[PDB]
Design a protein around this ligand. Structure first.
Ligand SMILES: O=C1CCc2ccc(O)cc2N1
Length: 115
């Protein structure tokens, strides 16, 4: 509260670390469904069903241009990619499996890096 401050994380390396995690995501062999935004003109249902599309290239642009206030807003966008994937794909599909795999991959890097 006013004039009562918590000790807080050293956050000075967060940008670099998030960039490294994103690079690791981008180069994972199962990243292919998530590298670019889904084409809303060509994919039936996607525009109506998925209220907030997100993809790695959009996250990369936001990270490169100061549009994440903190590391938690970055993690929210990454998770959104995989949450969207679950909404639109059966677990028993190539893309459904890819999303589950990438999510697991991300959360371990996240834990290992920041927790
Ligand atoms: O999540 C997605 C991205 C859009 C898409 C297009 C074609 C398809 O067979 C599956 C998908 N799932």
């Amino acid at each position: 509260s006013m004039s009562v401050k918590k000790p807080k994380r050293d956050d000075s390396k967060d940008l670099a670390l998030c960039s490294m995690i994103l690079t690791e995501m981008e180069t994972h062999e199962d990243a292919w469904p998530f590298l670019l935004p889904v084409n809303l003109k060509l994919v039936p249902g996607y525009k109506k069903v998925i209220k907030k599309p997100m993809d790695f290239s959009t996250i990369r642009e936001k990270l490169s241009s100061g549009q994440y206030p903190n590391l938690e807003t970055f993690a929210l966008d990454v998770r959104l990619v995989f949450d969207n994937c679950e909404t639109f794909n059966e677990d028993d599909s190539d893309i459904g499996r890819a999303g589950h795999n990438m999510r697991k991959y991300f959360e371990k890097k996240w834990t290992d890096t920041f927790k």
